[PDB]
Scaffold this active site. Structure first.
Site, PDB file in Angstrom:
ATOM      1  N   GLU A  53      10.147  55.758  13.763  1.00 18.22           N
ATOM      2  CA  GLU A  53      11.194  55.086  13.014  1.00 18.22           C
ATOM      3  C   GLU A  53      11.077  55.501  11.863  1.00 18.22           C
ATOM      4  OE1 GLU A  53       9.250  53.007  15.030  1.00 18.22           O
ATOM      5  OE2 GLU A  53       8.508  51.409  13.722  1.00 18.22           O
ATOM      6  N   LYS A  74      -0.691  46.136  19.310  1.00 19.50           N
ATOM      7  CA  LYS A  74      -1.007  46.964  20.224  1.00 19.50           C
ATOM      8  C   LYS A  74      -2.032  46.484  21.268  1.00 19.50           C
ATOM      9  CE  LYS A  74       2.432  48.989  18.557  1.00 19.50           C
ATOM     10  NZ  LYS A  74       3.804  48.290  19.078  1.00 19.50           N
ATOM     11  N   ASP A 120       6.988  50.388  23.521  1.00 15.33           N
ATOM     12  CA  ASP A 120       7.187  51.433  22.141  1.00 15.33           C
ATOM     13  C   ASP A 120       5.755  51.877  21.725  1.00 15.33           C
ATOM     14  OD1 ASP A 120       8.690  52.567  20.190  1.00 15.33           O
ATOM     15  OD2 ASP A 120       8.471  50.773  18.940  1.00 15.33           O
ATOM     16  N   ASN A 121       5.604  52.743  20.812  1.00 15.37           N
ATOM     17  CA  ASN A 121       4.584  53.142  20.081  1.00 15.37           C
ATOM     18  C   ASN A 121       3.481  53.808  20.862  1.00 15.37           C
ATOM     19  OD1 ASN A 121       5.689  50.409  18.286  1.00 15.37           O
ATOM     20  ND2 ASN A 121       5.855  52.459  17.273  1.00 15.37           N
ATOM     21  N   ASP A 146       6.513  45.458  22.249  1.00 18.54           N
ATOM     22  CA  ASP A 146       6.598  46.137  20.809  1.00 18.54           C
ATOM     23  C   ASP A 146       5.983  45.036  19.841  1.00 18.54           C
ATOM     24  OD1 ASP A 146       7.319  47.943  19.028  1.00 18.54           O
ATOM     25  OD2 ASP A 146       9.306  47.155  18.828  1.00 18.54           O
TER      26      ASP A 146
HETATM   27  N1  LIG Z   1       0.964  37.984  20.299  1.00 19.88           N
HETATM   28  C1  LIG Z   1       2.472  37.989  19.919  1.00 19.88           C
HETATM   29  N2  LIG Z   1       3.162  37.407  20.430  1.00 19.88           N
HETATM   30  C2  LIG Z   1       4.469  37.533  19.673  1.00 19.88           C
HETATM   31  N3  LIG Z   1       4.847  38.202  18.658  1.00 19.88           N
HETATM   32  C3  LIG Z   1       3.780  38.731  18.033  1.00 19.88           C
HETATM   33  C4  LIG Z   1       2.514  38.950  18.687  1.00 19.88           C
HETATM   34  N4  LIG Z   1       1.719  39.802  18.025  1.00 19.88           N
HETATM   35  C5  LIG Z   1       2.745  40.431  17.132  1.00 19.88           C
HETATM   36  N5  LIG Z   1       3.689  39.845  17.270  1.00 19.88           N
HETATM   37  C6  LIG Z   1       4.864  40.325  16.342  1.00 19.88           C
HETATM   38  O1  LIG Z   1       5.384  41.786  16.943  1.00 19.88           O
HETATM   39  C7  LIG Z   1       6.415  42.035  15.827  1.00 19.88           C
HETATM   40  C8  LIG Z   1       6.021  43.370  15.662  1.00 19.88           C
HETATM   41  S1  LIG Z   1       7.399  44.525  15.176  1.00 19.88           S
HETATM   42  C9  LIG Z   1       8.702  44.396  16.201  1.00 19.88           C
HETATM   43  C10 LIG Z   1       9.800  45.174  15.947  1.00 19.88           C
HETATM   44  C11 LIG Z   1      11.075  45.008  16.787  1.00 19.88           C
HETATM   45  N6  LIG Z   1      10.761  44.892  18.342  1.00 19.88           N
HETATM   46  C12 LIG Z   1      12.147  45.907  16.581  1.00 19.88           C
HETATM   47  O2  LIG Z   1      12.133  46.945  17.082  1.00 19.88           O
HETATM   48  O3  LIG Z   1      12.999  45.681  15.910  1.00 19.88           O
HETATM   49  C13 LIG Z   1       5.767  41.386  14.448  1.00 19.88           C
HETATM   50  O4  LIG Z   1       6.978  40.682  13.995  1.00 19.88           O
HETATM   51  C14 LIG Z   1       4.702  40.435  14.839  1.00 19.88           C
HETATM   52  O5  LIG Z   1       4.475  39.307  14.119  1.00 19.88           O
HETATM   53  O1  LIG Z   2       7.011  50.711  15.585  1.00 19.16           O
HETATM   54  C1  LIG Z   2       5.934  50.355  15.083  1.00 19.16           C
HETATM   55  C2  LIG Z   2       5.291  51.248  14.314  1.00 19.16           C
HETATM   56  C3  LIG Z   2       4.053  50.745  13.689  1.00 19.16           C
HETATM   57  C4  LIG Z   2       3.423  51.464  12.713  1.00 19.16           C
HETATM   58  C5  LIG Z   2       2.782  51.112  11.337  1.00 19.16           C
HETATM   59  C6  LIG Z   2       2.267  52.003  10.328  1.00 19.16           C
HETATM   60  C7  LIG Z   2       2.327  53.565  10.795  1.00 19.16           C
HETATM   61  F1  LIG Z   2       1.903  54.182   9.949  1.00 19.16           F
HETATM   62  C8  LIG Z   2       2.776  53.850  11.794  1.00 19.16           C
HETATM   63  C9  LIG Z   2       3.460  53.109  12.794  1.00 19.16           C
HETATM   64  C10 LIG Z   2       3.608  49.506  13.858  1.00 19.16           C
HETATM   65  C11 LIG Z   2       4.002  48.562  14.676  1.00 19.16           C
HETATM   66  N1  LIG Z   2       3.698  47.454  14.973  1.00 19.16           N
HETATM   67  C12 LIG Z   2       4.176  46.622  15.673  1.00 19.16           C
HETATM   68  C13 LIG Z   2       5.299  47.063  16.553  1.00 19.16           C
HETATM   69  N2  LIG Z   2       5.659  48.312  16.148  1.00 19.16           N
HETATM   70  C14 LIG Z   2       5.249  49.129  15.453  1.00 19.16           C
HETATM   71 CL   LIG Z   3      14.980  56.771  13.506  1.00 26.38          CL
HETATM   72 MG   LIG Z   4       7.369  49.560  17.497  1.00 22.14          MG
END
Ligand SMILES: Nc1ncnc2c1ncn2[C@@H]1O[C@H](CSCC[C@H](N)C(=O)O)[C@@H](O)[C@H]1O
Ligand SMILES: Oc1cc(-c2ccc(F)cc2)cc2nccnc12
Ligand SMILES: [Cl-]
Ligand SMILES: [Mg+2]
Length: 213
Positions: free
Chosen positions: A197, A142, A167-168, A139
């Site tokens: 979400e 991407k 996720d996603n 997560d």
């Molecule tokens: N290469 C990498 N290693 C570790 N974290 C990373 C990464 N690239 C992005 N991220 C981190 O990934 C996160 C995506 S959002 C994560 C949402 C969390 N899993 C939840 O559901 O609550 C961000 O905080 C971003 O800084």
């Molecule tokens: O759950 C997520 C949703 C989105 C995301 C952002 C913008 C939009 F418009 C739609 C979806 C980005 C995310 N990046 C890292 C980890 N999780 C993510």
């Molecule tokens: Cl939700």
């Molecule tokens: Mg996500």
């Protein structure tokens, strides 16, 4: 201050220390009513809960912690003695995640690693005494899903039966990862349709179970 700090402060002002459910509710309330944020959320969270309960993993790795919502979600359902490792590249978010888990009373079940997954994954065996992972929650950004999956395999961290949960896979999507795991005889894949979400937008989780080399 930042959105992430505002989420943490809201939790501290509205939730009960040592009560993971109250922490999750406070985050979801803030993110529904005040400011959207990329927490996995309650709809996809319920699917994650069901998967965690089915597999009862002893060791879980999370890629991407953010404010700790998914870490709280998973850590609260781990069996006694089971552990979560979570990697977060943004140091401010790593600190927020630690504080969130502290507030929730789950700090003894979780280790928060400050750094990039691509740099930390190769250190898991030597520095963190990992043999193999039972489950991985992907997560983070991407474009890292496929490279990190391949890196986990290279490093010997996957075993026959390791569950990847991504996720996603619809929004924003992870086209190379999804095509790769669905085309590979090394994975058995299942799709769980859900919603982005805090939005009436279709998203989903992909479960990809590693089959060995
Ligand atoms: N290469 C990498 N290693 C570790 N974290 C990373 C990464 N690239 C992005 N991220 C981190 O990934 C996160 C995506 S959002 C994560 C949402 C969390 N899993 C939840 O559901 O609550 C961000 O905080 C971003 O800084
Ligand atoms: O759950 C997520 C949703 C989105 C995301 C952002 C913008 C939009 F418009 C739609 C979806 C980005 C995310 N990046 C890292 C980890 N999780 C993510
Ligand atoms: Cl939700
Ligand atoms: Mg996500």
């Amino acid at each position: 201050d930042t959105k992430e700090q505002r989420i943490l402060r809201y939790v501290q002002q509205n939730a009960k220390p040592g009560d993971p459910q109250s922490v999750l509710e406070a985050i979801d309330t803030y993110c529904t009513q005040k400011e959207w944020a990329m927490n996995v959320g309650d709809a996809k969270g319920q699917i994650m809960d069901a998967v965690i309960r089915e597999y009862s993993p002893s060791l879980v790795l999370e890629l991407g912690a953010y404010c700790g919502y998914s870490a709280v979600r998973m850590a609260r359902l781990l069996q006694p003695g089971a552990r979560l490792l979570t990697m977060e590249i943004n140091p401010d978010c790593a600190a927020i995640t630690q504080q969130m888990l502290n507030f929730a009373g789950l700090q003894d079940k979780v280790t928060i690693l400050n750094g990039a997954s691509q740099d930390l994954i190769p250190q898991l065996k030597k520095k963190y005494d990992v043999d193999t992972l039972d489950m991985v929650f992907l997560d983070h950004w991407k474009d890292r899903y496929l490279p990190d999956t391949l890196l986990l395999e290279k490093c010997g961290l996957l075993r026959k039966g390791t569950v990847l949960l991504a996720d996603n896979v619809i929004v924003p999507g992870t086209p190379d990862f999804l095509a790769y795991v669905r085309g590979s005889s090394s994975f058995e894949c299942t799709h769980y349709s859900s919603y982005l979400e805090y939005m009436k937008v279709v998203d989903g989780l992909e479960k990809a179970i590693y089959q060995g080399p």
